Design a protein around this ligand. Sequence first.
Ligand SMILES: CC[C@H]1OC(=O)[C@H](C)[C@@H](O[C@H]2C[C@@](C)(OC)[C@@H](O)[C@H](C)O2)[C@H](C)[C@@H](O[C@@H]2O[C@H](C)C[C@H](N(C)C)[C@H]2O)[C@](C)(O)C[C@@H](C)C(=O)[C@H](C)[C@@H](O)[C@]1(C)O
Lengths: 7, 118, 122, 55
Amino acid sequence: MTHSMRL
Amino acid sequence: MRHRKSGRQLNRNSSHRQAMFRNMAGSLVRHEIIKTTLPKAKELRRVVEPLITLAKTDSVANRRLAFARTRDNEIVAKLFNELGPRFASRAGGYTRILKCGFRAGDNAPMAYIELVDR
Amino acid sequence: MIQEQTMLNVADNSGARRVMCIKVLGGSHRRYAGVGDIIKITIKEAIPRGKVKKGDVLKAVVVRTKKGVRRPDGSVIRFDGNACVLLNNNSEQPIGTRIFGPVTRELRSEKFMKIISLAPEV
Amino acid sequence: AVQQNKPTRSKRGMRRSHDALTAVTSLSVDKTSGEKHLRHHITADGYYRGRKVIA
RNA sequence: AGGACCGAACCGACUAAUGUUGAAAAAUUAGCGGAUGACUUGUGGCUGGGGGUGAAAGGCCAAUCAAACCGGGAGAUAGCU
RNA sequence: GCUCGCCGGAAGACCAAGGGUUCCUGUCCAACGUUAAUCGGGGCAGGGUGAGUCGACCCCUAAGGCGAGGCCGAAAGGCG
RNA sequence: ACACAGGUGGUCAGGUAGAGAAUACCAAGGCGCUUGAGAGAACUCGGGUGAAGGAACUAGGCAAAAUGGUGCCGUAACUUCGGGAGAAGGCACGCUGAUAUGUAGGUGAGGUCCCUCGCGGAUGGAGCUGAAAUCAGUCGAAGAUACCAGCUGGCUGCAACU
RNA sequence: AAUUCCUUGUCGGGUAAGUUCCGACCUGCACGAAUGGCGUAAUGAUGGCCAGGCUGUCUCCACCCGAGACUCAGUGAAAU
RNA sequence: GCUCAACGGAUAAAAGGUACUCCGGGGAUAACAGGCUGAUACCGCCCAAGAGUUCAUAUCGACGGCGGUGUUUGGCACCUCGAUGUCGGCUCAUCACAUCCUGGGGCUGAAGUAGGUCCCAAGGGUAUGGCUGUUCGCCAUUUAAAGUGGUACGCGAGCUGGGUUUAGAACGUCGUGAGACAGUUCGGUCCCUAUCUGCCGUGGGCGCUGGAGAACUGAGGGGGGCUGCUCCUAGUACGAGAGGACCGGAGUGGACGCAUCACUGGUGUUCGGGUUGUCAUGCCAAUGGCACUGCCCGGUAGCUAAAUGCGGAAGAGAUAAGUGCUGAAAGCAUCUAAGCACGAAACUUGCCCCGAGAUGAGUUCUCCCUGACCCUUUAAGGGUCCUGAAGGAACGUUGAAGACGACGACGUUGAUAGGCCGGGUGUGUAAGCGCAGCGAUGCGUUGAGCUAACCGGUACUAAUGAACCGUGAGGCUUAACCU
Ligand SMILES: CC[C@H]1OC(=O)[C@H](C)[C@@H](O[C@H]2C[C@@](C)(OC)[C@@H](O)[C@H](C)O2)[C@H](C)[C@@H](O[C@@H]2O[C@H](C)C[C@H](N(C)C)[C@H]2O)[C@](C)(O)C[C@@H](C)C(=O)[C@H](C)[C@@H](O)[C@]1(C)O
């Protein structure tokens, strides 16, 4: 859900 | 922060507190000595002593106020017939607390609350 | 206690019927305006024949508050409805001639003496 | 939330140093019967300060 | 009359809050939508794995789905840790 | 037992399915019960289920299944 | 997986107020949900009230507050001529008395005729039930008094709609 | 413009002030006619914007009522 | 007979997409943050053409040169891929100074007012809104001012989740297509009960050399430190005039903080009243339960702000930039080398709070203990009996004290709490009876009845006589004295 991910 | 506030909440709301005090006042006037917890006994002092002061004058209005605060006609009968002429001399202090150990189940501080006749 | 976005009525007959406070003048971070306090207003509703039109950004002075002013006697005078008298943006002089309704004796000072010599009650 | 490493048995005993239950200092003797009781409590046989209170 | 209107049972799940080692591996509370129909529900059948079924999202097929599970090839293979 | 409170198109009363003895009586309180327990849907011993008419079984059928022969298919099997 | 705030088909369904299987309080009946006792800090949860202001909050009026019933009056653009529309916006609502020793309505006995005779048909109104309205009076700060119970309007993109 | 880069295009309206909104103009980087174009009443737990009412959203929090948190007794975890 | 040209030639023969993805690894290798560096960026200086009527150096400073900082854009790949959660907002901050305001000065192309520029200075302060996801920016309106940076572009085991950056869907464009796009658009689960350090509070133990109860000195530590406007001097000094002070003195505000409820208010589910529905007390009347405190209307005490008091200082010391006095070196000159004086919101005090665990454990006052013996490793020794003192703790009633401890008052030789009495307050004319009325209801009794937390009293009730801990004159050495 790419909010905590370092993307 | 409770600065000069009387009354104990006793982990109830207002309706439960008032109904519980009415039941305990009925049981205390009925049996003349009851076992209870300690802070409920102190609050029961502050509840049941104005009823005995109300019994010191016997009229229709005072008996209707006692019925409005006890809702038992046998209780108001015993008040206005026995506890009125018996407690007529002493001014306040119609009741007596005595501590009696602790409860076996929840380790609650026990007390006997009784009337000063016995 | 007039702060910003407060909708005040107009006490004199400058033409506006309803104004809105957009800034309480005097001092950084000032919150409120009492009677003696100038406010900056915009005009939200005007009469069709008046001296000022809708959208004018000018100054006014509060004359009545619902919160009310306190006298040194311990008293307090609370009106009903908030009101202001409209002023010239730089000259600080009132625009309309007659002033409707009561004002306070707290207002007694030079420019507002020019105001207060028009009102029916003080 | 969790510890970085477990505490010792030493730090456990130092923490539990304040958990000692206080004893009653001394029970008081009634005047008539002589039975021990707590202060300001009635006896088991229902005496308080030399007066039979409960039946 | 009406895939009509308002609104309970019933079916669903729009918003917020709480819960997030839960009371609950999908809830509760307070509002919310449909509510005579392209409705909902019971009981029983039928379709099956490169197959089914899909008012279509690669959704669902027993808390498992860009190929279910079980068992066997099988100690697959691993220049990788 | 007496008061107080709560539900009451249910938090009441009958069943189907699903459980399977949990029903009732006496006795016990190690474990179970999120505490204590003298209590229990717990342990233990006994008791309890009575039908021509209620239901199943039974007669008949739906969707569907199986299917003598038959047709088809390397075999298994498929369809009828 | 639990003595788990979940799920699970049919039958019955009383009183008062209510259009009602909603909702409020009750009946028959069944329960107080297998840890309690105190105290009455911060903080958290679920609520109640709030001076002056009234969206200044914020990504955004999110969440709350508000609105809410019946009868009557009135209601625009636009339109596929059905709608829009409950548009919008108002007014009156309690209790008592009188009309009216309860009316209009509903039911309709005893009696009296007819008969082809009974579970028949006509008059007749007892008795019961019973709105809604107007007038007059009265009480309250407030009469849809609680629970219950639409926020409304203007412009616009997309998809006709269920 | 659900399409526009440059860009918050420029002008107008709405605001005290408007990168969003509405109306226009065409310079259409890179619309366009059944992978439909342009409208459109009604509908939508649809997207954007404005207004009235309403309010603890806010200025700026205050107090109260209950359930935890705190103390006492009983039982008694977990991640690490 | 091989552009087997990827030329030591995997096959005779081979392109893509994955944001639906999966696995094994990697900080061997990128994005974020840190490190090193400093081209770039920012700040400072050097020379000086030229502008400034003349006049480089009031203010700018070309052509070029030298540094600083780490501070933008970068470079490198040192840490991290068996996880170091992003932009913005909120809450809370903290430091630097390269100072935005306030304060102190020098020069001015400084008449005054107001500026420009440079030096010193970090005590305090340093907006609200519209638009935008925005930081930024534009804009509106204020202000004394609307500083610039560091702190993982501070801050998600503190909150949010609008933006980017998962899965849905669409537009433009690219692609034959699956799909792709620092291009847009609508929608989209933010876990954690704190062990340790830290910090805010609040206790127990022991120590401080006999024990105890008090009151202090204060080493040291913290808080605080902002500023506008008006009036007077004075429309004076200055200036043709328009304008218009320095210095000094009061008043009155804004923001901020501390305190407290006398006022004005809020709250006041524990007080009084109204009222709707229903159930019950046999019924009427009167009450009670439930309906969010059923809905409301007032409101006591407490708590509290929007209410009301107070504060920021003056002074002193030592100074920064700066200005001097005397004065040589260097017959002069010179604020400086000797010597002397001034000089800021910074520093040290002055104001307020904590504070002797200040182990360097301080001082002062008061009070309390004045008994016998035995043993042994005759030691600052052990033991036995007798005495338990001042005081403390425990218990109880409690408190405008409190999470619990603690703190404070009291314990009958007594007002500590409840009750009771009287008052006050609040609400608004109780019930019953009688009259008027057909009635709802009105009137009289009646400003009645009821009243929480308030006030002044009163032993009526509960605070029991005791038991428990704590001891029995307190080491050595040296000095100074007293008998
Ligand atoms: C109910 C409680 C659940 O946690 C959450 O919902 C929170 C809120 C997730 O964030 C959710 C929601 C969200 C938005 O993060 C808040 C999203 O970005 C992540 C991917 O999932 C967490 C924390 C994720 O971690 C994050 O994963 C990232 C890949 C890296 C990140 N790390 C760098 C710091 C790390 O913390 C992640 C993977 O789910 C954790 C694993 C262990 C789990 O699956 C566990 C079982 C969780 O599901 C949970 C504890 O039950």
